[PDB]
């Protein structure tokens, strides 16, 4: 995916226009750059089981970018040329492709769709065509029911991954009566509820977290 980061794009242009004259004669600069770009463009392209590398988030892409600029700066700062330059430059492009594939594997291990319940939307970048699209994690809206007990304050709806989802404007929830009717108690950017001076008249609830254009994010029932 590093070919989609403008830092890598501008770096390789500066690599050819300035630093290749320090290591290679001018007759093969274009030939070497075609070999360099073919390796970079293969980053994250899910060929073959290697399905997790197909896309990464914006946090992973910046790690691979600054890891790549670190090694590209190492190649230029050396004074090795000849058959050793092409050899080290090729081991470099092969090394960063492994560093990237670790980040993409670590991404899908603990960051890609970590939601235990509900629908989550994550911002991803697809490495083949450099297209950034909203990815949808489809889990059942039913996040179970809580049995909170509180007379003389009474409802936590936030999940640990709610802070990381995208498109979440505000959470609104109501009180489902025995008549199966819903009355919107409150709606706001607050991820909880607190009503002072509770009484024996407040004895079923239901939370609803709403996205912009992806439906309801999470719903959570309650028994007080």
């Amino acid at each position, epitope marked *: 995916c590093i070919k989609c980061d403008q830092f890598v794009t501008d770096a390789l242009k500066t690599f050819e226009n300035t630093y290749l004259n320090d290591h*290679l004669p001018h007759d093969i600069h274009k*030939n070497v750059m075609r070999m360099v770009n073919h390796e970079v463009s293969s980053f994250g392209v899910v060929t073959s089981e290697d399905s997790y590398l197909g896309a990464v988030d914006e946090n992973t892409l910046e790690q691979a970018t600054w890891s790549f600029l670190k090694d590209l700066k190492r190649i230029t700062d050396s004074d090795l040329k*000849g*058959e050793l330059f*092409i050899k080290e430059l090729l081991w470099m492009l092969r090394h960063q492709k492994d560093i990237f594939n670790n980040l993409a594997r670590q991404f899908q291990k603990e960051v890609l769709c970590p939601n235990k319940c509900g629908v989550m939307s994550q911002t991803l970048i697809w490495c083949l065509k450099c297209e950034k699209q909203l990815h949808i994690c489809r889990k059942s809206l039913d996040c179970g029911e809580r049995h909170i007990e509180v007379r003389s304050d009474l409802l936590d709806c936030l999940l640990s991954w709610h802070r990381a989802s995208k498109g979440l404007t505000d959470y609104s929830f109501y009180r489902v009566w025995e008549n199966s009717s819903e009355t919107l108690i409150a709606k706001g950017k607050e991820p909880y509820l607190t009503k002072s001076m509770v009484g024996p008249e407040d004895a079923n609830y239901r939370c609803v977290l709403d996205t912009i254009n992806q439906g309801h994010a999470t719903v959570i029932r309650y028994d007080v």
Partner: antibody
Amino acid sequence: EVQLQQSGAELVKPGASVKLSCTASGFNIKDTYMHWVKQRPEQGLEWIGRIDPANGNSKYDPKFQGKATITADTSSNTAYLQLSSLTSEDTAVYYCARWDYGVYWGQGTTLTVSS
Amino acid sequence: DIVLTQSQKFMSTSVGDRVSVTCKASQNVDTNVAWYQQKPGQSPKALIYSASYRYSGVPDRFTGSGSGTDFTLTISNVQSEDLAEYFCQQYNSYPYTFGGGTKLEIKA
């Protein structure tokens, strides 16, 4: 058009020393490493060493360090290979090559060592 | 010194079949092997660098693979102009070694 025209055929007595040359065209010699290789019909190819005429440094196959000395003239675009203490085992064809994203050889120089 | 051995001294083929030269390294070269073609009398010509990457002038029928210890150079569609000797060369460590040759003769 990159071309490497090296020295002509040499024929010398055992013990003498030859300095076979190699002139480069189409690229500056200082922007690259330049290697020397000997070839015999029975023992195959053997890598001798390299040189970068930018810094004058040369690396060798340790079994050829007592005989070969690869020097170069950065202003004349010419790489030289000197072989000292010449014996009959040195009768071979000697190639000079450029090696930086591509290998460009010379036509080869035939060294014949016999009294 | 690393010892590259091409087992087949030289192997036969036909005017259209595919041929595949192999050479084994006594140590781990780790994709640092080149291949050369040398017709008799002339200097060799470089075909492949880093075991898989091919130079511009080389025809696409030539292709190489292999990693670590075993390397194979495969000519997919030979022609009479490809009948020559082929060398593999390890440049992973000093000194660079060249191993034996392999001449692609035609069966008769």
